[PDB]
Amino acid sequence: SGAIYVGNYRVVNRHLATHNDWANLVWEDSSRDLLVSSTTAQGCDTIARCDCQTGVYYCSSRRKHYPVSFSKPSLIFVEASEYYPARYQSHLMLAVGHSEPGDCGGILRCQHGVVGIVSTGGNGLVGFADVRDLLWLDEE
Ligand SMILES: COc1ccccc1[C@H](OC)C(=O)N1CCC[C@H](C(N)=O)C1
Ligand SMILES: [Zn+2]
């Protein structure tokens, strides 16, 4: 689990969105595994606007932050799961790092700010949904 809190937005994995998220919906995209809802309180996270390919992510199944090198956002095949059928997920970045299903939502960050959240993984891989192209997260 986990979310990004920027401005008056909450960014979560679409597959983990709550009823309150759906009832306060701003934007969602199944092909990216992302959903954004509106918040009453202002958040403290800032979004990175950069070209970094190295950063640090939070792994809840280890209670630890790990440095990683990650691929550029791209269209990657993700196996059928209990949340989606076998499909291509867009704007996904892969790295070598520990992950388990419940690690979705952990933040990936660089020196510029938040880059994305854990969205996929398996066998010593972890995948992150990029948010750096979502420029509107920085405005009302
Ligand atoms: C962090 O997730 C894992 C880590 C290690 C092993 C397995 C997983 C997850 O179960 C397969 C996984 O990759 N997904 C399940 C939830 C929806 C994700 C998606 N964005 O399509 C895919
Ligand atoms: Zn950066």
Short mmCIF file of N, CA, C and O and ligand atoms in Angstrom, two decimals:
data_model
loop_
_atom_site.label_atom_id
_atom_site.label_comp_id
_atom_site.label_asym_id
_atom_site.label_seq_id
_atom_site.Cartn_x
_atom_site.Cartn_y
_atom_site.Cartn_z
N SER A 1 0.85 -1.20 0.00
CA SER A 1 0.00 0.00 0.00
C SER A 1 0.88 1.25 0.00
O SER A 1 2.10 1.17 0.31
N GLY A 2 0.29 2.41 -0.29
CA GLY A 2 1.02 3.68 -0.25
C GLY A 2 0.48 4.66 -1.28
O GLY A 2 -0.15 4.26 -2.26
N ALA A 3 0.73 5.93 -1.04
CA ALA A 3 0.23 6.99 -1.94
C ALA A 3 1.23 8.13 -2.01
O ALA A 3 2.13 8.25 -1.14
N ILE A 4 1.12 8.97 -3.04
CA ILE A 4 1.81 10.25 -3.14
C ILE A 4 0.80 11.33 -2.75
O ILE A 4 -0.34 11.33 -3.25
N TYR A 5 1.19 12.27 -1.87
CA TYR A 5 0.30 13.38 -1.44
C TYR A 5 0.95 14.68 -1.91
O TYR A 5 1.89 15.19 -1.26
N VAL A 6 0.50 15.20 -3.06
CA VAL A 6 1.04 16.42 -3.64
C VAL A 6 -0.11 17.39 -3.78
O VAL A 6 -1.18 17.06 -4.33
N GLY A 7 0.05 18.62 -3.26
CA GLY A 7 -1.03 19.60 -3.36
C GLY A 7 -2.31 19.05 -2.72
O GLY A 7 -2.25 18.44 -1.66
N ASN A 8 -3.44 19.16 -3.45
CA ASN A 8 -4.70 18.56 -3.00
C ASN A 8 -5.02 17.29 -3.80
O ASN A 8 -6.22 17.01 -4.03
N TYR A 9 -3.99 16.50 -4.09
CA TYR A 9 -4.16 15.24 -4.81
C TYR A 9 -3.56 14.10 -4.01
O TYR A 9 -2.53 14.26 -3.32
N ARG A 10 -4.17 12.93 -4.14
CA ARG A 10 -3.69 11.64 -3.62
C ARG A 10 -3.51 10.73 -4.83
O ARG A 10 -4.51 10.50 -5.56
N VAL A 11 -2.29 10.25 -5.06
CA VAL A 11 -1.99 9.37 -6.21
C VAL A 11 -1.79 7.96 -5.68
O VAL A 11 -0.86 7.75 -4.82
N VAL A 12 -2.58 7.02 -6.16
CA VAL A 12 -2.51 5.62 -5.69
C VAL A 12 -2.49 4.69 -6.86
O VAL A 12 -2.80 5.06 -8.03
N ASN A 13 -2.13 3.41 -6.60
CA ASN A 13 -2.30 2.37 -7.63
C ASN A 13 -3.81 2.25 -7.89
O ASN A 13 -4.60 2.12 -6.93
N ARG A 14 -4.20 2.24 -9.16
CA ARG A 14 -5.66 2.15 -9.46
C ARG A 14 -6.23 0.88 -8.84
O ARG A 14 -7.35 0.90 -8.34
N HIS A 15 -5.46 -0.23 -8.86
CA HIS A 15 -6.00 -1.50 -8.36
C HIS A 15 -6.20 -1.51 -6.85
O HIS A 15 -6.87 -2.44 -6.34
N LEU A 16 -5.64 -0.54 -6.11
CA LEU A 16 -5.79 -0.42 -4.64
C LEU A 16 -6.66 0.77 -4.24
O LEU A 16 -6.81 1.06 -3.05
N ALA A 17 -7.28 1.46 -5.22
CA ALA A 17 -8.11 2.62 -4.87
C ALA A 17 -9.29 2.22 -4.00
O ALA A 17 -9.92 1.17 -4.21
N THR A 18 -9.62 3.09 -3.06
CA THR A 18 -10.76 2.85 -2.14
C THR A 18 -12.06 3.44 -2.71
O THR A 18 -12.06 4.20 -3.71
N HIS A 19 -13.23 3.16 -2.05
CA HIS A 19 -14.47 3.79 -2.46
C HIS A 19 -14.37 5.30 -2.33
O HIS A 19 -14.86 6.01 -3.21
N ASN A 20 -13.71 5.80 -1.25
CA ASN A 20 -13.58 7.25 -1.12
C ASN A 20 -12.78 7.85 -2.30
O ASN A 20 -13.09 8.93 -2.76
N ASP A 21 -11.75 7.12 -2.78
CA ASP A 21 -10.99 7.59 -3.94
C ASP A 21 -11.91 7.71 -5.18
O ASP A 21 -11.91 8.74 -5.87
N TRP A 22 -12.71 6.66 -5.44
CA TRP A 22 -13.62 6.68 -6.58
C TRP A 22 -14.69 7.76 -6.45
O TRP A 22 -15.09 8.31 -7.48
N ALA A 23 -15.14 8.05 -5.22
CA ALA A 23 -16.16 9.07 -5.01
C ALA A 23 -15.62 10.50 -5.07
O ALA A 23 -16.39 11.46 -5.12
N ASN A 24 -14.28 10.65 -5.10
CA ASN A 24 -13.59 11.97 -5.17
C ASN A 24 -12.58 11.94 -6.33
O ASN A 24 -11.45 12.43 -6.21
N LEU A 25 -12.96 11.31 -7.43
CA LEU A 25 -12.04 11.01 -8.51
C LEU A 25 -11.63 12.22 -9.30
O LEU A 25 -12.50 13.02 -9.72
N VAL A 26 -10.33 12.35 -9.60
CA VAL A 26 -9.80 13.37 -10.50
C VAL A 26 -9.47 12.75 -11.87
O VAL A 26 -9.81 13.32 -12.92
N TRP A 27 -8.75 11.63 -11.87
CA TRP A 27 -8.28 11.01 -13.11
C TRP A 27 -7.90 9.58 -12.87
O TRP A 27 -7.41 9.28 -11.76
N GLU A 28 -8.11 8.69 -13.82
CA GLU A 28 -7.66 7.31 -13.67
C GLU A 28 -7.28 6.75 -15.01
O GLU A 28 -7.91 7.11 -16.05
N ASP A 29 -6.34 5.81 -15.03
CA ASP A 29 -5.90 5.19 -16.27
C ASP A 29 -5.48 3.76 -15.99
O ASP A 29 -4.43 3.51 -15.34
N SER A 30 -6.31 2.79 -16.42
CA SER A 30 -6.04 1.39 -16.21
C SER A 30 -4.72 0.94 -16.87
O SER A 30 -3.97 0.12 -16.30
N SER A 31 -4.42 1.46 -18.06
CA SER A 31 -3.19 1.08 -18.77
C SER A 31 -1.94 1.50 -18.05
O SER A 31 -0.90 0.91 -18.29
N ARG A 32 -2.00 2.46 -17.13
CA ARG A 32 -0.87 2.91 -16.31
C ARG A 32 -0.94 2.40 -14.85
O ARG A 32 -0.01 2.64 -14.07
N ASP A 33 -2.05 1.75 -14.44
CA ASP A 33 -2.30 1.38 -13.04
C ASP A 33 -2.29 2.58 -12.10
O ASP A 33 -1.87 2.47 -10.94
N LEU A 34 -2.83 3.74 -12.55
CA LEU A 34 -2.84 4.93 -11.69
C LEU A 34 -4.25 5.49 -11.50
O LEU A 34 -5.10 5.44 -12.43
N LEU A 35 -4.47 6.05 -10.31
CA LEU A 35 -5.71 6.79 -10.02
C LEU A 35 -5.34 7.94 -9.11
O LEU A 35 -4.49 7.81 -8.19
N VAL A 36 -5.99 9.09 -9.34
CA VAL A 36 -5.76 10.29 -8.53
C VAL A 36 -7.11 10.76 -7.99
O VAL A 36 -8.07 10.91 -8.78
N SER A 37 -7.18 11.00 -6.69
CA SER A 37 -8.38 11.54 -6.05
C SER A 37 -8.04 12.86 -5.39
O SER A 37 -6.85 13.24 -5.20
N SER A 38 -9.08 13.64 -5.03
CA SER A 38 -8.88 14.94 -4.39
C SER A 38 -8.86 14.82 -2.87
O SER A 38 -9.48 13.91 -2.29
N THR A 39 -8.09 15.70 -2.20
CA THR A 39 -7.93 15.68 -0.74
C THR A 39 -8.34 17.01 -0.14
O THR A 39 -8.23 18.06 -0.77
N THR A 40 -8.76 16.96 1.14
CA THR A 40 -9.09 18.20 1.85
C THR A 40 -7.79 18.86 2.34
O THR A 40 -7.62 20.07 2.17
N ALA A 41 -6.88 18.06 2.87
CA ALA A 41 -5.61 18.61 3.38
C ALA A 41 -4.52 18.67 2.30
O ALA A 41 -4.50 17.81 1.41
N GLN A 42 -3.61 19.65 2.35
CA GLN A 42 -2.50 19.76 1.41
C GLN A 42 -1.39 18.81 1.77
O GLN A 42 -1.08 18.62 2.96
N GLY A 43 -0.81 18.15 0.75
CA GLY A 43 0.29 17.23 0.95
C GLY A 43 1.66 17.85 0.87
O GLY A 43 1.82 18.97 0.38
N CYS A 44 2.69 17.06 1.28
CA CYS A 44 4.07 17.58 1.32
C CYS A 44 4.99 16.99 0.29
O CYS A 44 6.17 17.39 0.25
N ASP A 45 4.56 16.02 -0.51
CA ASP A 45 5.42 15.45 -1.53
C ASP A 45 5.53 16.40 -2.71
O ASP A 45 4.57 17.12 -3.03
N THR A 46 6.66 16.43 -3.37
CA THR A 46 6.84 17.22 -4.62
C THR A 46 7.21 16.25 -5.71
O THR A 46 7.90 15.26 -5.48
N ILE A 47 6.75 16.51 -6.93
CA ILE A 47 7.02 15.62 -8.07
C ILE A 47 8.30 16.02 -8.79
O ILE A 47 8.52 17.22 -9.13
N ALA A 48 9.13 15.06 -9.08
CA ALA A 48 10.34 15.27 -9.86
C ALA A 48 9.97 15.61 -11.32
O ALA A 48 9.05 14.99 -11.92
N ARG A 49 10.74 16.57 -11.91
CA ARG A 49 10.54 16.95 -13.32
C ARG A 49 11.93 16.87 -13.93
O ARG A 49 12.65 17.88 -14.06
N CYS A 50 12.31 15.67 -14.28
CA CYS A 50 13.70 15.38 -14.62
C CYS A 50 13.81 14.16 -15.48
O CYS A 50 12.88 13.47 -15.80
N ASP A 51 15.11 13.82 -15.79
CA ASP A 51 15.46 12.65 -16.57
C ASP A 51 16.26 11.61 -15.76
O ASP A 51 16.96 10.80 -16.36
N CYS A 52 16.15 11.59 -14.43
CA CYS A 52 16.91 10.61 -13.64
C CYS A 52 16.53 9.19 -13.98
O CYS A 52 15.35 8.88 -14.18
N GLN A 53 17.52 8.31 -13.97
CA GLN A 53 17.37 6.84 -14.12
C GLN A 53 17.99 6.09 -12.94
O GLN A 53 18.17 4.88 -12.99
N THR A 54 18.31 6.81 -11.86
CA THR A 54 18.75 6.25 -10.62
C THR A 54 17.92 6.95 -9.49
O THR A 54 17.58 8.14 -9.62
N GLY A 55 17.64 6.21 -8.45
CA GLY A 55 16.87 6.77 -7.34
C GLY A 55 16.81 5.78 -6.20
O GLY A 55 17.61 4.84 -6.14
N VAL A 56 15.82 5.96 -5.30
CA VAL A 56 15.65 5.13 -4.13
C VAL A 56 14.18 4.80 -3.97
O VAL A 56 13.35 5.70 -4.15
N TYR A 57 13.85 3.54 -3.68
CA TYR A 57 12.43 3.21 -3.47
C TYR A 57 12.23 2.60 -2.08
O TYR A 57 13.13 1.95 -1.52
N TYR A 58 10.99 2.71 -1.57
CA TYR A 58 10.59 2.08 -0.32
C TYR A 58 9.94 0.70 -0.56
O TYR A 58 8.98 0.58 -1.31
N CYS A 59 10.48 -0.28 0.13
CA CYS A 59 10.06 -1.68 0.06
C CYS A 59 9.41 -2.07 1.41
O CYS A 59 10.12 -2.36 2.40
N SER A 60 8.08 -2.10 1.48
CA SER A 60 7.39 -2.41 2.74
C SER A 60 7.65 -3.81 3.26
O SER A 60 7.71 -4.01 4.47
N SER A 61 7.89 -4.79 2.35
CA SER A 61 8.19 -6.16 2.77
C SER A 61 9.58 -6.36 3.35
O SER A 61 9.91 -7.46 3.79
N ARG A 62 10.39 -5.29 3.35
CA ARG A 62 11.70 -5.28 4.01
C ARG A 62 11.82 -4.13 5.02
O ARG A 62 12.87 -3.99 5.67
N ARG A 63 10.84 -3.25 5.11
CA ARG A 63 10.93 -2.02 5.91
C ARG A 63 12.22 -1.24 5.58
O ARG A 63 12.93 -0.75 6.49
N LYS A 64 12.56 -1.14 4.30
CA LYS A 64 13.82 -0.56 3.90
C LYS A 64 13.69 0.21 2.61
O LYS A 64 12.86 -0.13 1.74
N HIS A 65 14.55 1.23 2.46
CA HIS A 65 14.69 1.99 1.22
C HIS A 65 15.91 1.45 0.49
O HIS A 65 16.97 1.26 1.13
N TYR A 66 15.84 1.21 -0.80
CA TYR A 66 16.95 0.66 -1.58
C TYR A 66 17.26 1.56 -2.75
O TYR A 66 16.35 2.00 -3.48
N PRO A 67 18.56 1.79 -3.00
CA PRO A 67 18.96 2.48 -4.25
C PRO A 67 18.76 1.59 -5.47
O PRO A 67 19.02 0.36 -5.38
N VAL A 68 18.33 2.14 -6.56
CA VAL A 68 18.08 1.35 -7.79
C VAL A 68 18.43 2.16 -9.02
O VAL A 68 18.29 3.37 -9.07
N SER A 69 18.82 1.43 -10.08
CA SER A 69 18.87 1.91 -11.46
C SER A 69 17.60 1.42 -12.17
O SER A 69 17.29 0.22 -12.04
N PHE A 70 16.90 2.26 -12.91
CA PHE A 70 15.64 1.84 -13.51
C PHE A 70 15.58 2.25 -14.96
O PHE A 70 16.24 3.22 -15.39
N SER A 71 14.83 1.51 -15.76
CA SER A 71 14.68 1.79 -17.18
C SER A 71 13.79 3.00 -17.43
O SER A 71 13.04 3.43 -16.56
N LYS A 72 13.85 3.57 -18.63
CA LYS A 72 13.01 4.69 -18.99
C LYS A 72 11.55 4.21 -19.13
O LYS A 72 11.31 3.03 -19.44
N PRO A 73 10.56 5.08 -18.92
CA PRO A 73 9.16 4.64 -18.98
C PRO A 73 8.82 4.04 -20.34
O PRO A 73 9.18 4.61 -21.37
N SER A 74 8.20 2.86 -20.32
CA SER A 74 7.91 2.19 -21.58
C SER A 74 6.71 1.26 -21.42
O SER A 74 6.12 1.13 -20.36
N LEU A 75 6.35 0.63 -22.55
CA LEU A 75 5.22 -0.29 -22.64
C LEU A 75 5.76 -1.69 -22.41
O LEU A 75 6.56 -2.21 -23.22
N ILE A 76 5.37 -2.31 -21.31
CA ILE A 76 5.86 -3.62 -20.87
C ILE A 76 4.74 -4.61 -20.63
O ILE A 76 3.68 -4.26 -20.08
N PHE A 77 4.96 -5.87 -21.03
CA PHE A 77 3.95 -6.91 -20.83
C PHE A 77 3.94 -7.31 -19.37
O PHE A 77 4.98 -7.54 -18.76
N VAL A 78 2.73 -7.30 -18.76
CA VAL A 78 2.60 -7.70 -17.37
C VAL A 78 1.63 -8.90 -17.35
O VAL A 78 0.54 -8.82 -17.89
N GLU A 79 2.10 -9.96 -16.70
CA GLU A 79 1.34 -11.20 -16.63
C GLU A 79 -0.03 -11.02 -15.97
O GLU A 79 -0.20 -10.13 -15.16
N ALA A 80 -1.03 -11.88 -16.31
CA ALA A 80 -2.36 -11.88 -15.66
C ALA A 80 -2.18 -12.02 -14.17
O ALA A 80 -1.36 -12.79 -13.70
N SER A 81 -2.96 -11.24 -13.42
CA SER A 81 -2.92 -11.31 -11.97
C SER A 81 -4.39 -11.34 -11.47
O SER A 81 -5.32 -11.32 -12.29
N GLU A 82 -4.60 -11.25 -10.15
CA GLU A 82 -5.98 -11.11 -9.64
C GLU A 82 -6.57 -9.73 -9.85
O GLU A 82 -7.76 -9.56 -9.64
N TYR A 83 -5.77 -8.75 -10.37
CA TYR A 83 -6.24 -7.38 -10.56
C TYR A 83 -6.41 -6.98 -11.99
O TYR A 83 -7.20 -6.11 -12.28
N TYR A 84 -5.63 -7.62 -12.92
CA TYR A 84 -5.72 -7.31 -14.35
C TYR A 84 -5.47 -8.60 -15.17
O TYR A 84 -4.63 -9.37 -14.79
N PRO A 85 -6.05 -8.69 -16.37
CA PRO A 85 -5.65 -9.77 -17.30
C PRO A 85 -4.26 -9.47 -17.88
O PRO A 85 -3.73 -8.33 -17.72
N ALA A 86 -3.67 -10.42 -18.60
CA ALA A 86 -2.37 -10.23 -19.25
C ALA A 86 -2.49 -9.10 -20.23
O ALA A 86 -3.46 -9.02 -20.97
N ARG A 87 -1.61 -8.07 -20.08
CA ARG A 87 -1.75 -6.89 -20.90
C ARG A 87 -0.43 -6.16 -20.94
O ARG A 87 0.49 -6.51 -20.22
N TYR A 88 -0.38 -5.13 -21.76
CA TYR A 88 0.74 -4.22 -21.77
C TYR A 88 0.38 -3.03 -20.86
O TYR A 88 -0.62 -2.35 -21.05
N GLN A 89 1.28 -2.71 -19.91
CA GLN A 89 1.17 -1.53 -19.04
C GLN A 89 2.09 -0.45 -19.59
O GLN A 89 3.26 -0.74 -19.88
N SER A 90 1.61 0.77 -19.72
CA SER A 90 2.40 1.87 -20.24
C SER A 90 3.04 2.68 -19.11
O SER A 90 2.62 2.59 -17.94
N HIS A 91 4.07 3.46 -19.47
CA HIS A 91 4.79 4.36 -18.58
C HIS A 91 5.36 3.59 -17.37
O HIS A 91 5.46 4.16 -16.26
N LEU A 92 5.80 2.36 -17.60
CA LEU A 92 6.35 1.49 -16.55
C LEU A 92 7.86 1.45 -16.65
O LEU A 92 8.40 1.38 -17.76
N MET A 93 8.55 1.51 -15.50
CA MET A 93 10.02 1.49 -15.41
C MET A 93 10.44 0.29 -14.59
O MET A 93 9.92 0.08 -13.48
N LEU A 94 11.39 -0.50 -15.06
CA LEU A 94 11.82 -1.69 -14.35
C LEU A 94 13.17 -1.53 -13.69
O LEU A 94 14.05 -0.86 -14.25
N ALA A 95 13.37 -2.22 -12.56
CA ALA A 95 14.63 -2.25 -11.86
C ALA A 95 14.81 -3.62 -11.22
O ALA A 95 13.86 -4.38 -11.03
N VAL A 96 16.07 -3.89 -10.82
CA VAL A 96 16.37 -5.07 -10.05
C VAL A 96 16.26 -4.64 -8.56
O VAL A 96 16.94 -3.71 -8.11
N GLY A 97 15.39 -5.29 -7.86
CA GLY A 97 15.14 -4.97 -6.45
C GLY A 97 14.12 -5.93 -5.91
O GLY A 97 13.30 -6.51 -6.66
N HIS A 98 14.12 -6.15 -4.57
CA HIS A 98 13.11 -7.01 -4.00
C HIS A 98 11.72 -6.34 -4.04
O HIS A 98 11.57 -5.16 -3.73
N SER A 99 10.72 -7.11 -4.34
CA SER A 99 9.32 -6.75 -4.22
C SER A 99 8.44 -7.96 -4.07
O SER A 99 8.81 -9.02 -4.58
N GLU A 100 7.26 -7.76 -3.41
CA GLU A 100 6.12 -8.67 -3.18
C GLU A 100 4.84 -7.84 -3.46
O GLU A 100 4.85 -6.60 -3.55
N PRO A 101 3.70 -8.50 -3.77
CA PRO A 101 2.50 -7.76 -4.28
C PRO A 101 2.04 -6.56 -3.44
O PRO A 101 1.73 -5.45 -3.98
N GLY A 102 2.06 -6.75 -2.13
CA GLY A 102 1.71 -5.73 -1.15
C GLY A 102 2.66 -4.54 -1.07
O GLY A 102 2.38 -3.58 -0.36
N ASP A 103 3.78 -4.59 -1.79
CA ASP A 103 4.71 -3.47 -1.87
C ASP A 103 4.22 -2.38 -2.82
O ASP A 103 4.80 -1.28 -2.82
N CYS A 104 3.13 -2.64 -3.61
CA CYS A 104 2.60 -1.57 -4.48
C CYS A 104 2.28 -0.35 -3.65
O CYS A 104 1.74 -0.43 -2.53
N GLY A 105 2.64 0.81 -4.17
CA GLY A 105 2.39 2.08 -3.51
C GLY A 105 3.63 2.73 -2.91
O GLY A 105 3.62 3.91 -2.55
N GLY A 106 4.69 1.92 -2.72
CA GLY A 106 5.93 2.49 -2.19
C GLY A 106 6.50 3.53 -3.15
O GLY A 106 6.49 3.34 -4.38
N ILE A 107 7.00 4.63 -2.61
CA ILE A 107 7.54 5.69 -3.48
C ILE A 107 8.94 5.41 -3.98
O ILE A 107 9.82 4.96 -3.24
N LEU A 108 9.14 5.72 -5.27
CA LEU A 108 10.45 5.86 -5.90
C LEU A 108 10.77 7.36 -6.01
O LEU A 108 9.90 8.12 -6.50
N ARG A 109 11.93 7.80 -5.57
CA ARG A 109 12.31 9.23 -5.59
C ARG A 109 13.73 9.37 -6.05
O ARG A 109 14.57 8.46 -5.95
N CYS A 110 14.05 10.58 -6.51
CA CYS A 110 15.43 11.00 -6.90
C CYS A 110 15.70 12.33 -6.15
O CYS A 110 14.94 12.76 -5.33
N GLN A 111 16.88 12.97 -6.45
CA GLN A 111 17.20 14.26 -5.82
C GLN A 111 16.19 15.37 -6.14
O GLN A 111 16.09 16.32 -5.38
N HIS A 112 15.37 15.21 -7.20
CA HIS A 112 14.40 16.22 -7.64
C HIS A 112 13.02 16.08 -7.01
O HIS A 112 12.17 16.97 -7.13
N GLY A 113 12.74 14.90 -6.43
CA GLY A 113 11.43 14.66 -5.85
C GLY A 113 10.92 13.26 -6.19
O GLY A 113 11.70 12.34 -6.49
N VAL A 114 9.59 13.09 -6.08
CA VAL A 114 8.96 11.77 -6.33
C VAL A 114 8.89 11.47 -7.80
O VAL A 114 8.41 12.30 -8.60
N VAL A 115 9.31 10.28 -8.18
CA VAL A 115 9.36 9.84 -9.56
C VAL A 115 8.15 8.97 -9.90
O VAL A 115 7.61 9.04 -11.02
N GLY A 116 7.71 8.12 -8.96
CA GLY A 116 6.61 7.19 -9.24
C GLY A 116 6.36 6.30 -8.05
O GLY A 116 6.88 6.56 -6.95
N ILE A 117 5.53 5.26 -8.26
CA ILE A 117 5.19 4.32 -7.17
C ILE A 117 5.35 2.90 -7.65
O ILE A 117 5.14 2.60 -8.83
N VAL A 118 5.66 1.97 -6.73
CA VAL A 118 5.72 0.55 -7.06
C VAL A 118 4.38 0.10 -7.65
O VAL A 118 3.32 0.42 -7.06
N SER A 119 4.42 -0.63 -8.78
CA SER A 119 3.20 -1.11 -9.45
C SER A 119 3.30 -2.59 -9.84
O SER A 119 2.26 -3.23 -9.93
N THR A 120 4.50 -3.15 -10.06
CA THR A 120 4.62 -4.56 -10.49
C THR A 120 5.89 -5.13 -9.86
O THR A 120 6.74 -4.39 -9.33
N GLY A 121 6.09 -6.44 -10.00
CA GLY A 121 7.38 -7.03 -9.59
C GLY A 121 7.40 -8.52 -9.84
O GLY A 121 6.43 -9.12 -10.34
N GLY A 122 8.48 -9.15 -9.37
CA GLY A 122 8.59 -10.62 -9.38
C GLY A 122 10.03 -11.03 -9.52
O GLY A 122 10.74 -10.41 -10.32
N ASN A 123 10.45 -12.16 -8.93
CA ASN A 123 11.78 -12.75 -9.10
C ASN A 123 12.96 -11.78 -9.09
O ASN A 123 13.86 -11.92 -9.93
N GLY A 124 13.03 -10.87 -8.13
CA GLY A 124 14.12 -9.92 -8.02
C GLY A 124 13.98 -8.75 -8.95
O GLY A 124 14.91 -7.96 -9.02
N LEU A 125 12.79 -8.53 -9.50
CA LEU A 125 12.47 -7.30 -10.25
C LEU A 125 11.42 -6.48 -9.50
O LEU A 125 10.59 -7.03 -8.70
N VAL A 126 11.43 -5.19 -9.72
CA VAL A 126 10.40 -4.28 -9.23
C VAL A 126 10.09 -3.30 -10.38
O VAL A 126 10.99 -2.81 -11.06
N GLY A 127 8.84 -2.98 -10.58
CA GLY A 127 8.40 -2.02 -11.61
C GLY A 127 7.66 -0.85 -11.00
O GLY A 127 6.88 -1.04 -10.05
N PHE A 128 7.90 0.31 -11.56
CA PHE A 128 7.36 1.59 -11.03
C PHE A 128 6.54 2.30 -12.09
O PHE A 128 6.96 2.43 -13.25
N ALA A 129 5.35 2.74 -11.69
CA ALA A 129 4.50 3.60 -12.54
C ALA A 129 5.05 5.02 -12.48
O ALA A 129 5.03 5.64 -11.38
N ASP A 130 5.57 5.57 -13.60
CA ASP A 130 6.09 6.93 -13.64
C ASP A 130 4.95 7.94 -13.47
O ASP A 130 3.85 7.73 -14.01
N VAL A 131 5.23 9.07 -12.80
CA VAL A 131 4.27 10.18 -12.72
C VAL A 131 4.91 11.49 -13.19
O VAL A 131 4.22 12.51 -13.15
N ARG A 132 6.15 11.49 -13.68
CA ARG A 132 6.84 12.74 -13.99
C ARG A 132 6.26 13.49 -15.16
O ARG A 132 6.50 14.72 -15.32
N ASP A 133 5.54 12.80 -16.04
CA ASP A 133 4.89 13.50 -17.19
C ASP A 133 3.55 14.15 -16.81
O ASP A 133 2.98 14.89 -17.65
N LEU A 134 3.01 13.87 -15.62
CA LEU A 134 1.68 14.40 -15.20
C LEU A 134 1.83 15.80 -14.64
O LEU A 134 1.86 16.01 -13.42
N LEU A 135 2.00 16.77 -15.54
CA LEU A 135 2.36 18.12 -15.13
C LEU A 135 1.28 18.79 -14.29
O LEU A 135 1.59 19.62 -13.42
N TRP A 136 0.02 18.41 -14.54
CA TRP A 136 -1.11 19.01 -13.84
C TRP A 136 -1.11 18.68 -12.34
O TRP A 136 -1.82 19.35 -11.56
N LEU A 137 -0.32 17.68 -11.88
CA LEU A 137 -0.26 17.42 -10.42
C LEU A 137 0.32 18.61 -9.68
O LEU A 137 0.09 18.75 -8.47
N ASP A 138 1.05 19.51 -10.38
CA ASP A 138 1.67 20.69 -9.73
C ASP A 138 0.77 21.92 -9.65
O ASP A 138 1.23 22.96 -9.13
N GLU A 139 -0.46 21.86 -10.22
CA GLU A 139 -1.40 23.01 -10.30
C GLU A 139 -2.72 22.68 -9.59
O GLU A 139 -3.08 21.51 -9.51
N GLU A 140 -3.52 23.71 -9.23
CA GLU A 140 -4.84 23.56 -8.61
C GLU A 140 -5.80 22.91 -9.61
O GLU A 140 -5.74 23.21 -10.81
C1 LIG B 1 4.76 -5.59 -6.64
O1 LIG B 1 4.02 -6.66 -7.27
C2 LIG B 1 4.58 -7.91 -7.28
C3 LIG B 1 5.83 -8.21 -6.75
C4 LIG B 1 6.30 -9.52 -6.78
C5 LIG B 1 5.54 -10.52 -7.33
C6 LIG B 1 4.30 -10.21 -7.86
C7 LIG B 1 3.80 -8.92 -7.85
C8 LIG B 1 2.37 -8.65 -8.30
O2 LIG B 1 1.64 -9.87 -8.44
C9 LIG B 1 1.83 -10.50 -9.70
C10 LIG B 1 2.28 -7.75 -9.55
O3 LIG B 1 3.25 -7.58 -10.26
N1 LIG B 1 1.06 -7.30 -9.91
C11 LIG B 1 -0.17 -7.58 -9.15
C12 LIG B 1 -0.98 -6.31 -8.92
C13 LIG B 1 -1.24 -5.59 -10.24
C14 LIG B 1 0.11 -5.28 -10.94
C15 LIG B 1 -0.08 -4.50 -12.23
N2 LIG B 1 0.32 -3.24 -12.21
O4 LIG B 1 -0.59 -5.03 -13.23
C16 LIG B 1 0.86 -6.58 -11.18
ZN ZN B 2 15.56 13.49 -10.76
#
